[PDB]
Amino acid sequence: STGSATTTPIDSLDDAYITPVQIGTPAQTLNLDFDTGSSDLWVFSSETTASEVXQTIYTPSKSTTAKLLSGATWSISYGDGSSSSGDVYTDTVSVGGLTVTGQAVESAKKVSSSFTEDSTIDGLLGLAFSTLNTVSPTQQKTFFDNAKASLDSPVFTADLGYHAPGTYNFGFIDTTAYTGSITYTAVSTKQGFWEWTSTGYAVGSGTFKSTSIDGIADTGTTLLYLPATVVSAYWAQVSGAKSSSSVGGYVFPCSATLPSFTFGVGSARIVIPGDYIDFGPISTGSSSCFGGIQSSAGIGINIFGDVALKAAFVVFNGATTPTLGFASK
């Protein structure tokens, strides 16, 4: 089997992307954030405290296929400070036409304020390795891990758009969605993520520096977080750019024509256009814009988030020894 679903930016800045997900019988359609940096599928629900709901909710008592997982609970927190917790059902879940039975659906009793405030996101669908799932006493498998027995190839691909719709595919590689060839590189699962080592970088039309960059491919992170020395080398080529303590990163004049940024995948090169690195005005009408490349020092790991991934066609190869592929597009 395969699935193919359209993923759409939630707002004018590409802060996150939502993808429809059908849960239960009859299907209840919720818009979820597909996240290669976590491993829980959780939703707003009829159990969620009423004052914390503003979203479409899952009602397990209206789904004939829902089963309570007796004794199971979950509790999760994320790098941006958000969190949620609750109890666990198994139910039928479909993405882009691909159906999994017995998927753990984590029903929120409570959600944090950032989730209440974001009317566009009805929950998360995690796509990292299942060792990161938060259900106790026994951890639950991701939608991808449950799908692998049935998929045509144990792979999924991410094709995110720049201020435009894009696609998540499960089980196949669309050879019309990219240019040149895919180059694959080794993955380490020792921390539960799609973790790999880039071979180096170049800024604009300058020289490629061979320096190993260990990082994670994360569709649920907005920006590109890289080592401080690398990020400094980039913004040195933007004459108005400066680090802003109060705003929380590099800012620059919206009128600038930004240089591209190139990263290494083995001997191959992925070029991020300068326009993608303009994240947008700090407020509507401002003359100052927020940078899309920021230092990873405060997070403690490098993160190839949406700014990087939306410049590439990205293959998440979930074979027993996993690998990660990138192509230009």
Add this chain to the structure above:
Amino acid sequence: PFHXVI
């Protein structure tokens, strides 16, 4: 901006 698990 978003940053998805700890």
